Design an enzyme around this catalytic site. Structure first.
Site, PDB file in Angstrom:
ATOM      1  N   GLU A  35       2.103 -31.621  15.863  1.00 35.49           N
ATOM      2  CA  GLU A  35       2.570 -30.254  15.478  1.00 35.49           C
ATOM      3  C   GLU A  35       1.369 -29.386  15.111  1.00 35.49           C
ATOM      4  O   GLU A  35       1.249 -28.286  15.552  1.00 35.49           O
ATOM      5  CB  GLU A  35       3.591 -30.352  14.300  1.00 35.49           C
ATOM      6  CG  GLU A  35       4.956 -30.876  14.673  1.00 35.49           C
ATOM      7  CD  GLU A  35       5.815 -29.987  15.575  1.00 35.49           C
ATOM      8  OE1 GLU A  35       5.331 -28.900  15.890  1.00 35.49           O
ATOM      9  OE2 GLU A  35       6.925 -30.392  16.011  1.00 35.49           O
ATOM     10  N   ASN A  46       6.813 -18.277  18.272  1.00 34.96           N
ATOM     11  CA  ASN A  46       7.743 -18.635  19.333  1.00 34.96           C
ATOM     12  C   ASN A  46       8.240 -17.403  20.101  1.00 34.96           C
ATOM     13  O   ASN A  46       8.262 -16.253  19.606  1.00 34.96           O
ATOM     14  CB  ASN A  46       8.896 -19.457  18.750  1.00 34.96           C
ATOM     15  CG  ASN A  46       8.397 -20.581  17.842  1.00 34.96           C
ATOM     16  OD1 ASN A  46       8.631 -20.588  16.640  1.00 34.96           O
ATOM     17  ND2 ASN A  46       7.672 -21.498  18.414  1.00 34.96           N
ATOM     18  N   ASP A  48      11.113 -16.390  20.707  1.00 37.47           N
ATOM     19  CA  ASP A  48      12.235 -15.707  20.016  1.00 37.47           C
ATOM     20  C   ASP A  48      11.766 -14.794  18.856  1.00 37.47           C
ATOM     21  O   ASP A  48      12.614 -14.247  18.145  1.00 37.47           O
ATOM     22  CB  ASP A  48      13.333 -16.734  19.554  1.00 37.47           C
ATOM     23  CG  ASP A  48      12.912 -17.592  18.306  1.00 37.47           C
ATOM     24  OD1 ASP A  48      11.731 -17.624  17.994  1.00 37.47           O
ATOM     25  OD2 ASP A  48      13.755 -18.186  17.594  1.00 37.47           O
ATOM     26  N   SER A  50      10.279 -15.862  16.071  1.00 36.09           N
ATOM     27  CA  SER A  50      10.082 -16.655  14.884  1.00 36.09           C
ATOM     28  C   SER A  50       8.599 -17.223  14.934  1.00 36.09           C
ATOM     29  O   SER A  50       7.908 -17.130  15.969  1.00 36.09           O
ATOM     30  CB  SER A  50      11.093 -17.777  14.731  1.00 36.09           C
ATOM     31  OG  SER A  50      10.907 -18.667  15.820  1.00 36.09           O
ATOM     32  N   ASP A  52       6.177 -20.721  13.529  1.00 31.76           N
ATOM     33  CA  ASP A  52       6.040 -22.040  12.929  1.00 31.76           C
ATOM     34  C   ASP A  52       4.779 -22.128  12.062  1.00 31.76           C
ATOM     35  O   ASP A  52       3.726 -21.609  12.474  1.00 31.76           O
ATOM     36  CB  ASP A  52       5.957 -23.082  14.026  1.00 31.76           C
ATOM     37  CG  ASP A  52       7.222 -23.176  14.889  1.00 31.76           C
ATOM     38  OD1 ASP A  52       8.326 -22.805  14.435  1.00 31.76           O
ATOM     39  OD2 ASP A  52       7.087 -23.690  15.996  1.00 31.76           O
ATOM     40  N   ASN A  59       9.805 -23.578  10.897  1.00 28.56           N
ATOM     41  CA  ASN A  59      10.144 -22.365  11.603  1.00 28.56           C
ATOM     42  C   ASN A  59      10.768 -21.330  10.637  1.00 28.56           C
ATOM     43  O   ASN A  59      11.511 -21.702   9.744  1.00 28.56           O
ATOM     44  CB  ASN A  59      11.055 -22.740  12.736  1.00 28.56           C
ATOM     45  CG  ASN A  59      11.395 -21.582  13.597  1.00 28.56           C
ATOM     46  OD1 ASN A  59      12.387 -20.939  13.341  1.00 28.56           O
ATOM     47  ND2 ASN A  59      10.583 -21.298  14.587  1.00 28.56           N
ATOM     48  N   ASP A 101      19.298 -32.456   7.740  1.00 24.58           N
ATOM     49  CA  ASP A 101      20.238 -31.427   8.255  1.00 24.58           C
ATOM     50  C   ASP A 101      21.256 -31.922   9.291  1.00 24.58           C
ATOM     51  O   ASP A 101      22.161 -31.193   9.628  1.00 24.58           O
ATOM     52  CB  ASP A 101      19.446 -30.259   8.868  1.00 24.58           C
ATOM     53  CG  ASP A 101      20.240 -28.986   8.936  1.00 24.58           C
ATOM     54  OD1 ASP A 101      20.756 -28.553   7.889  1.00 24.58           O
ATOM     55  OD2 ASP A 101      20.348 -28.420  10.041  1.00 24.58           O
TER      56      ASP A 101
END
Ligand SMILES: [Cl-]
Ligand SMILES: [Cl-]
Ligand SMILES: [Cl-]
Ligand SMILES: [Cl-]
Ligand SMILES: [Cl-]
Ligand SMILES: [Cl-]
Ligand SMILES: [Cl-]
Ligand SMILES: [Cl-]
Ligand SMILES: [Cl-]
Ligand SMILES: [Cl-]
Ligand SMILES: [Cl-]
Ligand SMILES: [Cl-]
Ligand SMILES: [Cl-]
Ligand SMILES: [Cl-]
Ligand SMILES: [Cl-]
Ligand SMILES: [Cl-]
Ligand SMILES: [Cl-]
Ligand SMILES: [Cl-]
Ligand SMILES: [Cl-]
Ligand SMILES: [Cl-]
Ligand SMILES: [Cl-]
Ligand SMILES: [Cl-]
Ligand SMILES: [Cl-]
Ligand SMILES: [Cl-]
Ligand code: NA
Ligand code: NA
Ligand SMILES: [Pt+2]
Ligand SMILES: [Pt+2]
Ligand SMILES: [Pt+2]
Ligand SMILES: [Pt+2]
Lengths: 129, 129
Positions: A35, A46, A48, A50, A52, A59, A101
């Site tokens: 990562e 990203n 979209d 967003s 990280d 995110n 989650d």
């Protein structure tokens, strides 16, 4: 801060990740390697809109506030900048919520693609934890 | 932290930017508006692999350490993450070094393209500084 491999594993153990929700420490080190290259200051945007953040590339869409991710939540109740600190507590605590989650470590796409099913134990070998 | 316009101008004045190297406060507010939308946590990656951080989008190639910008300097002697804090001291202090470097505010491409030559005074009007 750029962590060495064994240094991060020790920090992860101390900060409660070893076998957290069933995931051995090597899973968490492997995830962090792919990562962020063990770099607490890693960011990646990203498509979209967003971003990280940090050693586990958490995110901004769900987990932290960066004030530029439209329609997003802040489930870990932190500014995303907290995830870039040389102290990993915030990234660890938020990762515990992520991994709990429902999808476990599959939430980390690089974990699924590069760590899942492999000899993750190798990431902690040689280390005095 | 996302600043309001007048709030950032007050913070900039307090932190020594008003007329710093001859640049009125409105120049610095205009730069910050177009660089970051007044958001201390703004990051943007450049095609050269450097990253811009904070309200004035200070670049990792010369000015701050992010541990992932090959061959870079850290002229402001700070981690780039310091530039993302809700306290703007670090961004201000590093900006004073940038603006003193020879090219003045042309170092900020968005300043040159969007603020230079305009009625920058408008960015501080209505404000109680
Ligand atoms: Cl660092
Ligand atoms: Cl460091
Ligand atoms: Cl460092
Ligand atoms: Cl630790
Ligand atoms: Cl610690
Ligand atoms: Cl926040
Ligand atoms: Cl905050
Ligand atoms: Cl806040
Ligand atoms: Cl730590
Ligand atoms: Cl720590
Ligand atoms: Cl520590
Ligand atoms: Cl699981
Ligand atoms: Cl914030
Ligand atoms: Cl805030
Ligand atoms: Cl906030
Ligand atoms: Cl201030
Ligand atoms: Cl202050
Ligand atoms: Cl540093
Ligand atoms: Cl540091
Ligand atoms: Cl350091
Ligand atoms: Cl401030
Ligand atoms: Cl402050
Ligand atoms: Cl302040
Ligand atoms: Cl000048
Ligand atoms: Na968010
Ligand atoms: Na640098
Ligand atoms: Pt550092
Ligand atoms: Pt620690
Ligand atoms: Pt905040
Ligand atoms: Pt301040």
């Amino acid at each position: 801060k750029v962590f060495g491999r064994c240094e991060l594993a020790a920090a992860m153990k101390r900060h409660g990740l070893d076998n957290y929700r069933g995931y051995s420490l090597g899973n968490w080190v492997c995830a962090a390697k792919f990562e962020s290259n063990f770099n607490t200051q890693a960011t990646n945007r990203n498509t979209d809109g967003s971003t990280d953040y940090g050693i586990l590339q958490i995110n901004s869409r769900w987990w932290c506030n960066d004030g530029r991710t439209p329609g997003s939540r802040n489930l870990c109740n932190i500014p995303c900048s907290a995830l870039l600190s040389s102290d990993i507590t915030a990234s660890v605590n938020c990762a515990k919520k992520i991994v709990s989650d429902g999808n476990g470590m599959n939430a980390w796409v690089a974990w699924r693609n590069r760590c899942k099913g492999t000899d993750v134990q190798a990431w902690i070998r040689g280390c005095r934890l």
